[PDB]
Structures are given as C-alpha cells and as structure tokens.
Symmetry: C2
Subunit: 258 residues, 2 copies
C-alpha cells in the first residue's frame, strides 16, 4: 500500500466550528500495464464533502493520511469500475465512505483515459486534498443528514451522485395541488437552465447558483443566495454536465453508494 | 521554497487515542538534497529527526497527528555561539502548550553534525528537503515515563545525558536505600553506576534506544524499570560513552 501526503487550506483550530465544510479528494498517480507499461497517469478521486459537526475533524484527517491505499478493478452490472482501498479496519458510521467502509469505487471512465480493457493499475503516488468550501455553500440541515428521508435532488451526470437541493418555496409551485410532485415539477422546469461553473483556485470542485425566487436557504447552515457545491474530477469537461435529471435522493451520506 | 508535507509510516492505532497511557515516539525522516551554490551537481542524504515522545494523555492524539501530517516543512541553517545548527520549520501558526516543540513553537533545531555528514558541513553547501516521512511508533509496555505532575510541573530531576547533543533522559526516583550532603545522594548514586548502564537499540523500531535500570536503585508507569529515548537511526552504537549526570525538566514545554 501507499500513504498520501497533504495539500489544502484546512485549519485545525476551527475543528470545533461545526459549520465548516471540507471537500476531500484523493489525487493519484497511476502506472498502467503484457506490453510496455505507462507511468504517470494522474487521476482525481472525490471522497466526499463533510462538515465538522458530522465527525471529529482531526480523527477524520489523521485517519485519512495514516491509511495505506491500493487500487483494484472490478466489473459491476457490466460496467467497469476501479476501487481504491484503504487497508485495515474502517470506522463505523463515518460520513465518508472511504473511512466508513474501507473502500471507494469509481466508474473507470472517470479515472482511466478512454484509450484504455486489458490493462492493470497501481498507485505510484497519492495526495489528499482538503479544501474548505466557501461560506456561501448551502448544505442540508443536520436532521436531514442523519435522517432517512429522501429529497428533491438533481442528477447532473449519471456517474456522479445526485445533488440534494434546498427546499422549493411554496410560492414556486402555487398551482400544484400535489405536494409530493410540486417541488419536483418546479425543478424540472428550470433544470436545463442551471449553469455549472468550476470553482477557481480549488481542485475537483463545482458549484451551481440557484434562482432565489424558487429555493429557500432557511433550512441549511453557515441572508444570501442559494448555491450548491459538488465534487467532480479536476479534468472533468464543462460540456459534460448536460445529461441532467430530477430525482429524490437521501441526504444522509451513510445511504448513498455502490 | 513553499514547503513540503510528510507521508506517514508507523504502528500507531487511532482507536487507542483515548487510552492515555499509550506513548508514541515521533520522528521525521528526511531526504535532503545538498548542493554547492557554484556546482550544478546534487547529492541526496537521508536524515533522522526526533521530535519527541508523548503519551496520549498529554494532548489529543488525532489533533497531534493531523497537525503534524498537514504541516509544510522547510530546512534552514544558522550559527549560534559559533557552532552550526539546522532548523526544520513547520509553516504557519503554532499549537500553544503542545508537548512536542515542532507544533508548539513551529520549529525544531538540531546540531548540524547530527544531520549533515562532515563532508557536506561547509559553507558552500545549501540544503533542501526533497522528501519527508513522519514515523510514529508506539513504545512497548515496559516504558517508564515520568508521572503526570512531574510532566506538568516546574521542577528539575536527575537525568542522564547519554551524549552531549541529545536531550537528557529523566530517570525514575532513586531509592532512599541506595544513598547516604543529603541532596546529592540521587546524583551521586547515579554517577556511581553511570558508566555501567548499557544502551541497546530497540529492535523492529527506528531511531529508538532503551536503557534497563537496576531495580535495587530505581523505584517506579503504564502497561524492572526501563527508559526509552530517541536518537537518529544511523547514530553509531559506539557513540553513547560520553555520559554525564544532570538535572532536567520533565515538563516537555521547558526545553
């Protein structure tokens, strides 16, 4: 296995400010290999976004940087995946899948370039990026995060988890008598107008500013515009966020991956 | 430059962070590129940099480890009273009261001749950190360690300076049965067997040495008394003979 080293703007003196969020990402160098092996392919592996109240930060960070990691491959429902493994015992209930379950899978085509089905991989180098999300990040309320309720969310790409959204203002679906539909219909109505922009001077991080006339920030954390941040690989193309759909997803991070 | 952060290697178990009686030896292991400012050439050189030994009760372990592994480090040189030092710096703000100097003060100095080989000691040479690893090793069950109040206190105690450029090793209390004017017994008793003490390198551990102490002289303290101490992994075994008895603070904030 291989352990990472660190890069980021994280401040441990704020470990007790529960409303500080970090995006966590592994950045990897991978050597690929019967014929000549290719050395130095970089890849970007989001592990999650967490706020300090969800789990002690120092443990989280210590646990991540003390881990030895491995990369493996597997097929699932006829779809090629890549699993990065953190060796040894996980930690229960942990918001981030890597520490919780002791591994994290990615669709291969989100890590290995598409000129690669007869190739094996391994980690040459590993860096753990920890970046504080800006203060304008909207984030689900504590009870939604610990609950098992599902909420309106936007699937921005089929291979990224859906982005749970703030609550939709009653005013935005006046007409609709059905309240388990209303929010959903209102969202699909502007789904295709939403603009994804890359967050600058941050790696692997994107955001969507949402219309205020539709979305309320009353239910979140951290008098300002509703905006959601999400993680995608640093090299992910901007034109690749067009296959959108509206769904109901869990906010509770312990109930979303495969 | 801007700095570099370390990688981890060790046997530390975070699940024991709340067992206050677990001790870790903390050591930076470095690769250092040395270069004559006139020459293009570079050679690289490993070095072992002890930062301290801490028990879990002295400070939350996870903060300690997270703080160490998140730090960006640099190496610099300075002279003080004519003799040459090397300072490894951890960039940014400190952690006040922290047992380990590196986190507490944001830097740690070493005599140059305990980092850089003779031949690279001169002034035409500049040093850069190329690679950094943080070793964290749990000391074995038998480690003797000063009591909590001596560690928080203001008092000095009998200690052995095993080499002039390593910090001294505070010792357990000397049994009244072992000595006699009356506030020397401890110090005199120690010097009396100082040169019979045998330093052994700890096996399956880096940068770590121990001394078994006679029980008839020393009284006991975690899971015969034994003290562990840190020296560079490549420190020579014939180099623990220049010994002296001194008084040192047990409180690691005072050093």
């Amino acid at each position: 296995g291989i352990t990472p080293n660190y890069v980021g703007d994280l401040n441990l003196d704020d470990q007790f400010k529960g409303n500080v969020c970090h995006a966590f990402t592994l950045e990897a160098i991978i050597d690929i290999s019967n014929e000549r092996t290719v050395k130095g392919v970089p890849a970007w592996l989001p592990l999650g976004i967490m706020s300090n109240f969800e789990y002690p930060l120092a443990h989280t960070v210590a646990a991540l940087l003390t881990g030895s990691y491995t990369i493996t491959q597997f097929t699932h429902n006829g779809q090629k995946f890549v699993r990065v493994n953190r060796l040894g015992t996980g930690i229960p209930a942990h918001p981030l899948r890597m520490l919780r379950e002791g591994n994290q899978a990615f669709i291969q085509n989100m890590v290995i370039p598409r000129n690669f089905n007869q190739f094996t991989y391994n980690l040459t180098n590993l860096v753990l990026s920890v970046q504080k999300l800006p203060d304008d990040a909207w984030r689900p309320s504590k009870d939604k995060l610990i609950g098992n309720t599902m909420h309106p969310a936007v699937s921005i790409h089929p291979n990224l988890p859906p982005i749970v959204l703030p609550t939709v203002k009653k005013q935005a679906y006046r007409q609709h008598k059905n309240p388990n539909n209303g929010p959903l219909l209102a969202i699909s109505g502007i789904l295709h107008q939403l603009r994804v922009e890359k967050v600058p001077e941050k790696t692997s991080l994107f955001r969507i500013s949402l219309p205020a006339d539709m979305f309320s920030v009353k239910e979140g954390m951290m008098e300002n515009s509703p905006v959601v941040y999400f993680q995608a690989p640093e090299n992910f193309p901007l034109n690749g966020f067009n296959n959108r759909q509206v769904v109901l997803a869990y906010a509770n991070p312990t109930l979303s991956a495969v």
